[model samples]
Every structure is written in structure tokens, then in C-alpha cells.
Target: AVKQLIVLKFKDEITEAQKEEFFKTYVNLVNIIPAMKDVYWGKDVTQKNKEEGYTHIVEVTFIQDYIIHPAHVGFGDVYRSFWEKLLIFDYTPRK
Candidate 1:
């Protein structure tokens, strides 16, 4: 199993409707992309110390073959411009 973790800070002017549209397009990847599964996401809550700029977290599980999935390629095209800073982490369990 592979896990993809994406943390992002939206551009200062981003609106709720734009964010919704972006997520709707992104979540649809599960239906179109064979290797993707279990998409989940959340916003950061009040914490004493946290990453300065990040505001959202999206975590998705995928098969090893998802590295080149076309949906991921298109996904970025939709939302990349709305983000100021995006951090991505892809990993598989050691054991």
C-alpha cells in the first residue's frame, strides 16, 4: 500500500466555491483512476504549534502503480494555481 500526503496553503484570495470545485474534481479521481482509494482530508485545528503556512491536509491510499496515474496528473492542473505553497509526501510502509 502507498500513502500520499498533501499539505497546502491556499492563495490568500481563494474562495470557498473554488476550493469546493477543486476538491470535487480531485475526489472524482477514485472513480476514474484504478489505483486510487480511500481519499480523506481535513483542515488544521487550533494547535499550539503547527506548520506556519499549511491549512489543509489530504491523505489518499493507492497501489504501487499509482505513481504515474493520469488522474494525478490532471488533478494538479485544476488546483495547483490556487495554492501558494504545497507539500507532498508519498510513502509505503516499511513492514
Candidate 2:
């Protein structure tokens, strides 16, 4: 499986509890993408002890046909548009 890492900094309003919902929505939208082979994500739990406050952290992995600039199949504009909804939230930290 090929791993795709998208590091993002969310807005300060995002809380720990909301992350679960956020991930769920993201996963749902990503799953429908044709180019997307598979996906998995989770928060950065290792920072539990750190005092540095942040919204959340997520890592996603997608399996596709090849490593190219513009994917020919699988995920397309429609799929990505579905995910755009999640970005509508005002709480996520801006990276």
C-alpha cells in the first residue's frame, strides 16, 4: 500500500472530540474516490504530554494505479468535491 501524507494545521477551535467526526467524514468521502485504493487515518496521540496546543493530526494512505501527477482513474473531481465539505468547518487548525 502506498502512503500519502498530507500534513495540515487546523484552526484553534477544533477540539479532540471533534476529530473523530472529522476523520469519519473524511474517510467516507475518500472511500468513494475511484483513484483512492484505500485510506486510514488517526490523530497524533504521542503528543499527549506536550504543552504545545494544536487542533489535530492525521495521516492518510491511498492505493492507486501509479505515482503520477494527474491520476487518470479512481479519484476525480466529484470525489474531491465531496471531501470539500469537511473543509467547511471553522475549527480545524490551519497548517
Candidate 3:
């Protein structure tokens, strides 16, 4: 299995509704994209994240080690105006 981890911080002017919409679109993309196996996301509920500016964490699992799906194409650009910082990591299970 492969996992894509993303940590995001919103821009100052982004509204809560826009953030919600972005997440909703992200979740919905899983249904549309074939390479994706599973996904889950969360917010910094307890202020425990080491990255100080990050507000949300999203994890997406895929069946392949690395596969390009439509959701991965120009994915973040749609929400670029609302994003301040984004950190992404891709990992595969240790053999």
C-alpha cells in the first residue's frame, strides 16, 4: 500500500465555507478517481501538531506505489487562493 500525507494551512483571507468546500471536493474525488483506495482527514484538535502553522492533515491511500489520477492533476491549484502552506509526503509500506 502507498500513502500520501498532506498537511495544509489556510491563507488569512480564506473563509471557513471555502475550506469546507475544498475538503468536500477532496473527499468526493476519491469516488471519481480509480487509483485511490481510501482516504481520511483531520484537523488540529488539540494543538499537538509539530508543524505550527498547519491546520489540517489529509491522508490518501492508493493501491499502487505511485499513480496519476485526474484528482492529482492540477489538484491544489483549485484551492491555491485559499492555501497558505502545504506539506506533502508519499510513503510505501516497509517490506
Candidate 4:
């Protein structure tokens, strides 16, 4: 199994409504992609990672070949359209 954690910092011009919609799209992946195991997200409420300016928190877990899904293509297209900064972490959980 694999996990993906994404740290996103949106641009100043991004609107609140847009953020909501974008996140919804992300959360919906689990419904659309059968291979996806889970989708969850949160915000950096503590502001401790202040220097990084990362407020958006996202995580997805799934099997391999996740990238080949059509939903992922659309997801990436929309993802690249927004956000000023992005940091990603990947891991393989021990069996």
C-alpha cells in the first residue's frame, strides 16, 4: 500500500469559494476511482509551519497504478491550475 500527503499553499488571489470547490473535487476521488482506498484532508490550524505558508493538508492512500486513472488526470489538470506552492510526501506502509 502507498500513501500520498500533499502540502499546498494557495495564491493570494484564490477565493474562498474556489478553495472549497477544489477541495471537494479532491475528496470526491475516492468515490470516482475504485482503486482509491481513502481520501482525507485538513488545515494547518496551529500555524506552526508558518514559514512554509502551508495551510492546505491532503492525503490519499491507494494501491499502485493510481496515476494511470483518468480521474487522476483531471485532478492534476485542475491542481496545476491553482496553488502557489506544493509539497508532497510519499511512503509505502510496511506489510
Candidate 5:
């Protein structure tokens, strides 16, 4: 499976509602996009430690050919619209 571990740091002025909106958009992809398999996310736990400005994270699972899929590319555009510091790491898990 193709996976993406994305760390997001939004603008200082962005609010909780906007963050929730972002999360909803991401998690909803599984239902509409064929390549998307699953999505999980998390926010600050206990306390915000030395995370290097990263505030939240989302892990997305996809099929092997997800890279060239149109839905995946569309999601990429929406992600860019947020315009925050993003750290995206894509990989495959050892089973």
C-alpha cells in the first residue's frame, strides 16, 4: 500500500473550525476516490512539544497506482490551497 504521513503547520491566525474543515476534506476522500483506502489523523497530544512548528498530522493509505490518479491530483490542489508548511513523506509498509 502507498502511504503518506503528512505534517501540517497552519498560519498562526487559522482557527479550530478551519482546521476541522481541512481534516474533514481529507478524511472524506476515501468515499469518493478509488485509489484512497483509509485516512487517520491526530492533533496535539498532552502538550505541544518540540515539534518544529508542525501542529497536526494525517496518514493516508492508497493503492499502488494512486500517484497518477485524477482524484489524487485534485486533492493535491486542495492541499496546496491551504498554503501552510507541509512535510509529506510517502512510503510503503512492511507487512
Candidate 6:
């Protein structure tokens, strides 16, 4: 198993509606990724004025035997659901 860190930075210009949709999609993603060992995320609070800190930071521990790997492409299956169902916000990962 390995720990994967994901950070999403929304453009500061993103509207409130976009934020709500992004957060909703995030919740759905969490429920869909059952292979995930553990997952947690939220907005950055330490940087009061620094939008560069990223809007949401997520940590996930995954075992190759389950989530994302070279074979089976099961992970791709999970991601495809999000792409197909998420129609509201333009959310993206930083790195």
C-alpha cells in the first residue's frame, strides 16, 4: 500500500456556485472509491490570504492490489464515473 496526496487549487475567481458543485463532486468521489484505504480533505485554513495554498487537500492510502495499477484498469473505471456524472464545476487537481 502507498499513500497518495492530492491537492486541488481552484482559481480564486471561481464563483460560489462552482465551489458548491466541486465540493459535492468530491463527496461523491469519496463514496465511489471503495478501494481507498482512507481519505480525508477540506479547504485550506492556515493561509488566510494565500489562494496558492490550494482549496482542498486530500490524502488517500491505496493498495495496488485494489486501486489504480497497470493491469485491469479498474481505477480508470472509477475515474470514468466522475467524468461522466460531474457536470457542475470545473474542478482540477494541482499535482
Order of the predicted models by TM-score, top scorer first: 4, 1, 3, 5, 6, 2
Error of 5 at 17 (Å): 0.4
Which digits, one per residue and each the tens of the lDDT, describe model 5 over residues 1-95?
A: 67899888888777789778878987987888887889999986754665577778899987546666677678787756564688889998996
* Top candidate, metric lDDT: 4
Better of 2 and 4 by TM-score: 4
TM-score of 2: 0.45
Rank candidates, lDDT, best first.
Answer: 4, 1, 5, 3, 6, 2
lDDT head-to-head 4 vs 5, winner: 4
* Deviating ranges (above 4 Å) for candidate 5: 46-51, 63-70, 79-83
- Model 4 agreement with the true structure over 43-84: per-residue lDDT tens digits: 788998688898988988874466788788879986786899
* lDDT, candidate 3, at 21: 87
Cα-based TM-score, every candidate:
0.82, 0.45, 0.81, 0.86, 0.77, 0.46
Clashes of 6: 0
TM-score of 1: 0.82
Q: Is candidate 2 or candidate 3 better by TM-score?
A: 3
Residue-wise C-alpha lDDT for candidate 3, range 1-95, written one tens digit per residue: 77899889998898889888888888887877777778888888777755577889999988432245546555655767878888989889696
lDDT of each: 0.80, 0.46, 0.78, 0.85, 0.79, 0.51
Q: Candidate 3 — which residues are off by over 4 angstroms?
A: 49-51, 63-68, 93-95
* True-structure RMSD for candidate 1: 2.4
Clashes of 2: 13
Model 5 worst lDDT run, 10 consecutive residues: 44-53
Task: Please write out the lDDT profile of model 2 over residues 19-48, one tens digit for every residue.
Answer: 566566656655455555544665556666
Candidate 4 global CA lDDT score: 0.85
In every candidate, how many clashes are there?
A: 0, 13, 0, 0, 0, 0
